[PDB]
Amino acid sequence: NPAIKRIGNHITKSPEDKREYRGLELANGIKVLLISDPTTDKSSAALDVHIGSLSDPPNIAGLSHFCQHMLFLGTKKYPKENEYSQFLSEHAGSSNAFTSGEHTNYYFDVSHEHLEGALDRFAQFFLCPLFDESCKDREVNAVDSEHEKNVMNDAWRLFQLEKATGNPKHPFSKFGTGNKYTLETRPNQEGIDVRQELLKFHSAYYSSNLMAVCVLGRESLDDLTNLVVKLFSEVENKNVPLPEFPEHPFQEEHLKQLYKIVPIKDIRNLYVTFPIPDLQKYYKSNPGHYLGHLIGHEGPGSLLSELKSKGWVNTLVGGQKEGARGFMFFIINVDLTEEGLLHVEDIILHMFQYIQKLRAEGPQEWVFQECKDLNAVAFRFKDKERPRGYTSKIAGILHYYPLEEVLTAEYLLEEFRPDLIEMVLDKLRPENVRVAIVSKSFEGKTDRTEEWYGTQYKQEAIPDEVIKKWQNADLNGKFKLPTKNEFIPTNFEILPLEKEATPYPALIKDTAMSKLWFKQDDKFFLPKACLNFEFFSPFAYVDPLHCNMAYLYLELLKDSLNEYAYAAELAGLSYDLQNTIYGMYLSVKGYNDKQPILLKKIIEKMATFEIDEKRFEIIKEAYMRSLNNFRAEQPHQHAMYYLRLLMTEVAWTKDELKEALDDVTLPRLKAFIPQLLSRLHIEALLHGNITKQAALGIMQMVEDTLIEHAHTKPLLPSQLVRYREVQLPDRGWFVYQQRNEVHNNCGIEIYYQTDMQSTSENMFLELFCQIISEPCFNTLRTKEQLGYIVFSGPRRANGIQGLRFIIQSEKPPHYLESRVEAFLITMEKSIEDMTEEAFQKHIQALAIRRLDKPKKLSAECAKYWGEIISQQYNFDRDNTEVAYLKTLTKEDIIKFYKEMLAVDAPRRHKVSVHVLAREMDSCPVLSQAPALPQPEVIQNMTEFKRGLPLFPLVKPHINFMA
């Protein structure tokens, strides 16, 4: 009563959302949204502090981010550096946090039965962080590593280069991540006791008046209230003024500027920016979004359309970009074709012509009304959120909207504002534009360097002569506003539940041409459906060349429908179409009303496709760069890539692919498509607000369309070939080594292949993985600090599984190899030493993780899809496997380890991929690392697979139907 300052009134929610809500402000001024969901299997809490990088003291960059890391390492109440993390994993929970320029958001989830234990521990982060001295030195490393991975990343480099091109005095120029230099090195060589700096900052800013909390669980709103009051009213209120940044970081001297940047990958991009006022307050009208919607439009008449037709650009992004309380930006970025790179001037001219067209037409309330009506539908039928994301999201926005509005606030438009719309529009002018071109062509031509990432760039002033030509931009007949979106749904009737309906997808069609799986939605009751289609054809992956074609074909098809599908896009109807090693994949997700129309359009197009000369050349050129650009991917990604190539029966490599690419000609492609489409087998899963007859017809309509235009006939059954995984030999150990020429770190994946998937083998691996999950992180990272990326878990492919570790670090692979091997022995002991309850706790957490039920249609659909793709069709796996899981004993897991994992194990199957750093030319191969044998260094992948047997495929769980 006196701990609570205010109780908001009914929190406006959708009539579909059955969760209970209560808004409220505490005495200390913390804003809170309580969420009651009696059915959730996992509860959640999140706290957003409205302070971040921008408030980073000038002499210690990234203190806010560092502080973020440190709170997870111990409090007075719970001293153990890993007490928080360990408590979550043991109770099926997870957690994380992030830091932005004005916020620090911490969140977690845990089994619904441990919200308190969880939340209690969590609250200490904001009451008594210990900021231990030993944890501080260790963790400064993790941060450094995090920043390390970002250095060779084009996105991060441009993100910071912007901050560096504006007013240096503005806190916007700050380096938010920090690293070893700014967080330890420099501080030292300047006499700074960081543990104090952390303590300082935390006390100065973690004031209750600047915090929002969101908690969700099965407890009653009343119970949730007491709970939050109990653990949070004790957070002190130092009435700290919320940082404001009136006055744009981009001032006059920063306008009419041109920057030429050299990228890491081979990409071509034009970045156009305009400084705009902070539009956040205008959330009920959203003038910036109106302009974003139009300028960003991709349908007929749109700017993107003309820019694409002149073959200058391929994609476009327009709209308002966020800055901070006090300033925002309005951007328009397009990628560039080769020709496009030479018409940047003209491209920007068109941009100003389209904008001029907007001025000429003036606000358009029907467009507002359309966006408004759409958004209304969106909110009503919004899918239920996974609790963690939801709590995290509400927590952050509680800082911007009235308790009552925190839900509807970002979805419901309320007021039409011609005035605002015209105000922002008036800022999209040549006199205050910023232009940035990103091209390798600038290699050598630059004369400046961004200090933090090392970005190569030159700066010029845009010639008043040119600025002038842009102001004179007059209307262009190629530009027309969009017309009424005929794709907007209107039918939301949720069909009654057919009596013969079932709990799992049913096989309702089994023919040479197609195997149709179907399930009518029996739990989410939203006017949506998922139409998933698997197209099988040997000619999609038959050889490198055909792979490039299957890809280019589908990519050109998507390009043609783009302009037509953009509408369906904005209307909650979208499709995913891509080539696979088995042929093709198509998925249509969204409101069911208009799906059949889009589907039919998609299939009809792919069966009667006519390739454009110019589009083919442009797309191909990009595909080339795309394959090449893999060399700029992170080490650990390279590691996973290679291990995938090595363990799979068939697998063309990016080198092979780009080699075969030149041989792909327009004629050649035109011939490929019909051959691809001539013989197929389709396996589909239709799931949602749809009936069995509706579904059978969709399946028949697809089949029929193909038959009529591609004369497609059935694939033979024996032709339905699946690839196998290479069978490693008992007690073997191979090492395949490569070098990452861009990044300056090492990567590594170690895979201990066990056996074919199966109820028993599966759980043995899953329980063991559950048990070592946090310990691994805690050991290889928290303690040993090997690097930012440290992962462990099961590996599942081609029906086979195993335990694997992935690490990206500065230390050499062979070194990581040792520490891991060591960690393995540490776990063996740990397992012998843990109490029986400890063990049972782990079983329970695994169980809860597996039995967690999907909250939305796409989620449930996906689990099914997987059983189908894997041809295992084990739709009841979770109940079965958990049942079995509960039967395991500390003894079983020890046996499984001794037999499959232990360094001296009889059936240890070990493969390693070492990806060396840029600087290391070559290289070899506290805890006690078991003495390792002599690995057999893989010289050639083809040879490697030839000399080993291949496993069999898993036997399909016969789903007797008709």
Side-chain angles (χ1 to χ4, degrees), residues 801-820:
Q801 72 196 313
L803 185 191
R804 57 164 179 180
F805 290 90
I806 298 185
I807 299 175
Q808 174 164 300
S809 101
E810 175 183 50
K811 287 298 287 170
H814 69 266
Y815 178 64
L816 279 37
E817 193 74 50
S818 72
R819 301 282 69 230
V820 175

PDB file of all heavy atoms in Angstrom, residues 801-820:
ATOM      1  N   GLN A 801      24.114 -38.312 -34.534  1.00  0.00           N
ATOM      2  CA  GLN A 801      24.323 -37.252 -33.556  1.00  0.00           C
ATOM      3  C   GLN A 801      25.639 -37.386 -32.818  1.00  0.00           C
ATOM      4  O   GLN A 801      26.313 -38.403 -32.904  1.00  0.00           O
ATOM      5  CB  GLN A 801      23.178 -37.227 -32.543  1.00  0.00           C
ATOM      6  CG  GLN A 801      23.181 -38.393 -31.570  1.00  0.00           C
ATOM      7  CD  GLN A 801      21.842 -38.550 -30.857  1.00  0.00           C
ATOM      8  OE1 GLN A 801      21.274 -37.576 -30.367  1.00  0.00           O
ATOM      9  NE2 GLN A 801      21.336 -39.780 -30.792  1.00  0.00           N
ATOM     10  N   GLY A 802      25.993 -36.342 -32.084  1.00  0.00           N
ATOM     11  CA  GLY A 802      27.228 -36.356 -31.335  1.00  0.00           C
ATOM     12  C   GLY A 802      27.290 -35.113 -30.485  1.00  0.00           C
ATOM     13  O   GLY A 802      26.417 -34.255 -30.570  1.00  0.00           O
ATOM     14  N   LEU A 803      28.328 -35.022 -29.665  1.00  0.00           N
ATOM     15  CA  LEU A 803      28.534 -33.893 -28.780  1.00  0.00           C
ATOM     16  C   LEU A 803      29.574 -33.044 -29.467  1.00  0.00           C
ATOM     17  O   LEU A 803      30.533 -33.572 -30.012  1.00  0.00           O
ATOM     18  CB  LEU A 803      29.082 -34.389 -27.444  1.00  0.00           C
ATOM     19  CG  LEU A 803      29.296 -33.450 -26.254  1.00  0.00           C
ATOM     20  CD1 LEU A 803      30.096 -34.193 -25.207  1.00  0.00           C
ATOM     21  CD2 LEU A 803      30.049 -32.206 -26.650  1.00  0.00           C
ATOM     22  N   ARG A 804      29.406 -31.731 -29.444  1.00  0.00           N
ATOM     23  CA  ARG A 804      30.385 -30.870 -30.087  1.00  0.00           C
ATOM     24  C   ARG A 804      30.658 -29.604 -29.298  1.00  0.00           C
ATOM     25  O   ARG A 804      29.840 -29.166 -28.492  1.00  0.00           O
ATOM     26  CB  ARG A 804      29.893 -30.459 -31.460  1.00  0.00           C
ATOM     27  CG  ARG A 804      28.573 -29.772 -31.358  1.00  0.00           C
ATOM     28  CD  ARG A 804      28.242 -29.032 -32.605  1.00  0.00           C
ATOM     29  NE  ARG A 804      26.937 -28.403 -32.466  1.00  0.00           N
ATOM     30  CZ  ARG A 804      26.371 -27.671 -33.411  1.00  0.00           C
ATOM     31  NH1 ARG A 804      27.006 -27.487 -34.570  1.00  0.00           N
ATOM     32  NH2 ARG A 804      25.190 -27.114 -33.182  1.00  0.00           N
ATOM     33  N   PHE A 805      31.821 -29.019 -29.553  1.00  0.00           N
ATOM     34  CA  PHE A 805      32.218 -27.777 -28.908  1.00  0.00           C
ATOM     35  C   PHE A 805      32.631 -26.820 -30.008  1.00  0.00           C
ATOM     36  O   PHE A 805      33.237 -27.231 -31.010  1.00  0.00           O
ATOM     37  CB  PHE A 805      33.406 -27.984 -27.948  1.00  0.00           C
ATOM     38  CG  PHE A 805      33.062 -28.762 -26.714  1.00  0.00           C
ATOM     39  CD1 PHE A 805      33.172 -30.154 -26.694  1.00  0.00           C
ATOM     40  CD2 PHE A 805      32.577 -28.111 -25.581  1.00  0.00           C
ATOM     41  CE1 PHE A 805      32.800 -30.889 -25.563  1.00  0.00           C
ATOM     42  CE2 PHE A 805      32.201 -28.837 -24.449  1.00  0.00           C
ATOM     43  CZ  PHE A 805      32.313 -30.229 -24.440  1.00  0.00           C
ATOM     44  N   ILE A 806      32.281 -25.552 -29.828  1.00  0.00           N
ATOM     45  CA  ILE A 806      32.636 -24.524 -30.785  1.00  0.00           C
ATOM     46  C   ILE A 806      33.200 -23.335 -30.010  1.00  0.00           C
ATOM     47  O   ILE A 806      32.591 -22.859 -29.052  1.00  0.00           O
ATOM     48  CB  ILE A 806      31.398 -24.123 -31.646  1.00  0.00           C
ATOM     49  CG1 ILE A 806      30.916 -25.353 -32.443  1.00  0.00           C
ATOM     50  CG2 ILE A 806      31.764 -22.976 -32.599  1.00  0.00           C
ATOM     51  CD1 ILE A 806      29.799 -25.091 -33.420  1.00  0.00           C
ATOM     52  N   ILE A 807      34.378 -22.875 -30.417  1.00  0.00           N
ATOM     53  CA  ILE A 807      35.045 -21.758 -29.750  1.00  0.00           C
ATOM     54  C   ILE A 807      35.782 -20.869 -30.732  1.00  0.00           C
ATOM     55  O   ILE A 807      36.465 -21.336 -31.638  1.00  0.00           O
ATOM     56  CB  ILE A 807      36.154 -22.230 -28.775  1.00  0.00           C
ATOM     57  CG1 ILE A 807      35.586 -23.109 -27.673  1.00  0.00           C
ATOM     58  CG2 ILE A 807      36.879 -21.023 -28.191  1.00  0.00           C
ATOM     59  CD1 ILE A 807      36.685 -23.687 -26.781  1.00  0.00           C
ATOM     60  N   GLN A 808      35.658 -19.577 -30.540  1.00  0.00           N
ATOM     61  CA  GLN A 808      36.396 -18.655 -31.361  1.00  0.00           C
ATOM     62  C   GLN A 808      37.265 -17.957 -30.320  1.00  0.00           C
ATOM     63  O   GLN A 808      36.749 -17.390 -29.349  1.00  0.00           O
ATOM     64  CB  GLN A 808      35.458 -17.675 -32.043  1.00  0.00           C
ATOM     65  CG  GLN A 808      36.163 -16.578 -32.803  1.00  0.00           C
ATOM     66  CD  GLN A 808      35.223 -15.888 -33.751  1.00  0.00           C
ATOM     67  OE1 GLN A 808      34.658 -16.515 -34.651  1.00  0.00           O
ATOM     68  NE2 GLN A 808      35.042 -14.595 -33.561  1.00  0.00           N
ATOM     69  N   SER A 809      38.580 -18.030 -30.493  1.00  0.00           N
ATOM     70  CA  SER A 809      39.482 -17.411 -29.536  1.00  0.00           C
ATOM     71  C   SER A 809      40.763 -16.895 -30.159  1.00  0.00           C
ATOM     72  O   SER A 809      40.994 -17.025 -31.361  1.00  0.00           O
ATOM     73  CB  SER A 809      39.835 -18.392 -28.421  1.00  0.00           C
ATOM     74  OG  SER A 809      41.110 -18.951 -28.632  1.00  0.00           O
ATOM     75  N   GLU A 810      41.591 -16.297 -29.313  1.00  0.00           N
ATOM     76  CA  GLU A 810      42.856 -15.748 -29.748  1.00  0.00           C
ATOM     77  C   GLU A 810      43.917 -16.833 -29.607  1.00  0.00           C
ATOM     78  O   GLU A 810      44.873 -16.879 -30.386  1.00  0.00           O
ATOM     79  CB  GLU A 810      43.194 -14.534 -28.898  1.00  0.00           C
ATOM     80  CG  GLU A 810      44.551 -13.941 -29.168  1.00  0.00           C
ATOM     81  CD  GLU A 810      44.863 -12.781 -28.239  1.00  0.00           C
ATOM     82  OE1 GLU A 810      44.702 -12.947 -27.003  1.00  0.00           O
ATOM     83  OE2 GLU A 810      45.273 -11.710 -28.749  1.00  0.00           O
ATOM     84  N   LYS A 811      43.745 -17.707 -28.616  1.00  0.00           N
ATOM     85  CA  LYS A 811      44.690 -18.796 -28.404  1.00  0.00           C
ATOM     86  C   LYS A 811      44.511 -19.784 -29.563  1.00  0.00           C
ATOM     87  O   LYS A 811      43.408 -19.928 -30.102  1.00  0.00           O
ATOM     88  CB  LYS A 811      44.452 -19.484 -27.039  1.00  0.00           C
ATOM     89  CG  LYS A 811      44.886 -18.669 -25.788  1.00  0.00           C
ATOM     90  CD  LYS A 811      46.428 -18.358 -25.729  1.00  0.00           C
ATOM     91  CE  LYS A 811      47.316 -19.592 -25.377  1.00  0.00           C
ATOM     92  NZ  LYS A 811      48.810 -19.412 -25.530  1.00  0.00           N
ATOM     93  N   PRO A 812      45.602 -20.464 -29.971  1.00  0.00           N
ATOM     94  CA  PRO A 812      45.617 -21.444 -31.070  1.00  0.00           C
ATOM     95  C   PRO A 812      44.701 -22.647 -30.859  1.00  0.00           C
ATOM     96  O   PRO A 812      44.433 -23.042 -29.733  1.00  0.00           O
ATOM     97  CB  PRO A 812      47.081 -21.845 -31.142  1.00  0.00           C
ATOM     98  CG  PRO A 812      47.489 -21.764 -29.711  1.00  0.00           C
ATOM     99  CD  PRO A 812      46.907 -20.447 -29.289  1.00  0.00           C
ATOM    100  N   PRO A 813      44.219 -23.250 -31.951  1.00  0.00           N
ATOM    101  CA  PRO A 813      43.334 -24.405 -31.812  1.00  0.00           C
ATOM    102  C   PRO A 813      43.867 -25.506 -30.911  1.00  0.00           C
ATOM    103  O   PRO A 813      43.182 -25.914 -29.967  1.00  0.00           O
ATOM    104  CB  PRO A 813      43.143 -24.876 -33.253  1.00  0.00           C
ATOM    105  CG  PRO A 813      43.206 -23.614 -34.018  1.00  0.00           C
ATOM    106  CD  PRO A 813      44.373 -22.879 -33.366  1.00  0.00           C
ATOM    107  N   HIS A 814      45.085 -25.981 -31.179  1.00  0.00           N
ATOM    108  CA  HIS A 814      45.643 -27.073 -30.378  1.00  0.00           C
ATOM    109  C   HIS A 814      45.551 -26.784 -28.897  1.00  0.00           C
ATOM    110  O   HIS A 814      45.387 -27.708 -28.095  1.00  0.00           O
ATOM    111  CB  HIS A 814      47.099 -27.381 -30.749  1.00  0.00           C
ATOM    112  CG  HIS A 814      48.070 -26.304 -30.376  1.00  0.00           C
ATOM    113  ND1 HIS A 814      48.464 -25.317 -31.256  1.00  0.00           N
ATOM    114  CD2 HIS A 814      48.758 -26.082 -29.230  1.00  0.00           C
ATOM    115  CE1 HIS A 814      49.357 -24.540 -30.670  1.00  0.00           C
ATOM    116  NE2 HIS A 814      49.552 -24.983 -29.440  1.00  0.00           N
ATOM    117  N   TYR A 815      45.648 -25.504 -28.540  1.00  0.00           N
ATOM    118  CA  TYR A 815      45.556 -25.099 -27.141  1.00  0.00           C
ATOM    119  C   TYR A 815      44.125 -25.278 -26.606  1.00  0.00           C
ATOM    120  O   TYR A 815      43.915 -25.808 -25.505  1.00  0.00           O
ATOM    121  CB  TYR A 815      45.980 -23.639 -26.960  1.00  0.00           C
ATOM    122  CG  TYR A 815      45.847 -23.216 -25.523  1.00  0.00           C
ATOM    123  CD1 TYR A 815      46.621 -23.822 -24.536  1.00  0.00           C
ATOM    124  CD2 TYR A 815      44.860 -22.312 -25.125  1.00  0.00           C
ATOM    125  CE1 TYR A 815      46.414 -23.556 -23.192  1.00  0.00           C
ATOM    126  CE2 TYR A 815      44.642 -22.038 -23.770  1.00  0.00           C
ATOM    127  CZ  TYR A 815      45.426 -22.674 -22.810  1.00  0.00           C
ATOM    128  OH  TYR A 815      45.195 -22.468 -21.469  1.00  0.00           O
ATOM    129  N   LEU A 816      43.149 -24.815 -27.386  1.00  0.00           N
ATOM    130  CA  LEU A 816      41.743 -24.934 -27.026  1.00  0.00           C
ATOM    131  C   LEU A 816      41.466 -26.416 -26.864  1.00  0.00           C
ATOM    132  O   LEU A 816      40.878 -26.870 -25.878  1.00  0.00           O
ATOM    133  CB  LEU A 816      40.889 -24.360 -28.146  1.00  0.00           C
ATOM    134  CG  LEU A 816      40.752 -22.840 -28.150  1.00  0.00           C
ATOM    135  CD1 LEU A 816      42.032 -22.157 -27.731  1.00  0.00           C
ATOM    136  CD2 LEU A 816      40.334 -22.410 -29.522  1.00  0.00           C
ATOM    137  N   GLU A 817      41.917 -27.162 -27.863  1.00  0.00           N
ATOM    138  CA  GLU A 817      41.783 -28.603 -27.906  1.00  0.00           C
ATOM    139  C   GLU A 817      42.128 -29.217 -26.514  1.00  0.00           C
ATOM    140  O   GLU A 817      41.410 -30.085 -25.990  1.00  0.00           O
ATOM    141  CB  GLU A 817      42.723 -29.109 -29.015  1.00  0.00           C
ATOM    142  CG  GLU A 817      42.530 -30.549 -29.456  1.00  0.00           C
ATOM    143  CD  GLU A 817      41.300 -30.746 -30.302  1.00  0.00           C
ATOM    144  OE1 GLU A 817      41.123 -29.978 -31.272  1.00  0.00           O
ATOM    145  OE2 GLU A 817      40.521 -31.676 -29.995  1.00  0.00           O
ATOM    146  N   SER A 818      43.217 -28.737 -25.912  1.00  0.00           N
ATOM    147  CA  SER A 818      43.656 -29.231 -24.611  1.00  0.00           C
ATOM    148  C   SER A 818      42.692 -28.890 -23.484  1.00  0.00           C
ATOM    149  O   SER A 818      42.247 -29.767 -22.742  1.00  0.00           O
ATOM    150  CB  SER A 818      45.016 -28.655 -24.255  1.00  0.00           C
ATOM    151  OG  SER A 818      44.886 -27.286 -23.924  1.00  0.00           O
ATOM    152  N   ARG A 819      42.390 -27.609 -23.343  1.00  0.00           N
ATOM    153  CA  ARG A 819      41.479 -27.164 -22.302  1.00  0.00           C
ATOM    154  C   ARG A 819      40.127 -27.889 -22.393  1.00  0.00           C
ATOM    155  O   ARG A 819      39.533 -28.233 -21.366  1.00  0.00           O
ATOM    156  CB  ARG A 819      41.297 -25.651 -22.405  1.00  0.00           C
ATOM    157  CG  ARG A 819      42.600 -24.862 -22.274  1.00  0.00           C
ATOM    158  CD  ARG A 819      43.039 -24.746 -20.815  1.00  0.00           C
ATOM    159  NE  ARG A 819      43.475 -26.016 -20.237  1.00  0.00           N
ATOM    160  CZ  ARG A 819      43.053 -26.513 -19.072  1.00  0.00           C
ATOM    161  NH1 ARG A 819      42.162 -25.868 -18.326  1.00  0.00           N
ATOM    162  NH2 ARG A 819      43.534 -27.667 -18.644  1.00  0.00           N
ATOM    163  N   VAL A 820      39.646 -28.138 -23.610  1.00  0.00           N
ATOM    164  CA  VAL A 820      38.380 -28.834 -23.750  1.00  0.00           C
ATOM    165  C   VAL A 820      38.561 -30.234 -23.221  1.00  0.00           C
ATOM    166  O   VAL A 820      37.818 -30.696 -22.358  1.00  0.00           O
ATOM    167  CB  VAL A 820      37.906 -28.943 -25.223  1.00  0.00           C
ATOM    168  CG1 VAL A 820      36.618 -29.815 -25.300  1.00  0.00           C
ATOM    169  CG2 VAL A 820      37.628 -27.566 -25.782  1.00  0.00           C
TER     170      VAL A 820
END
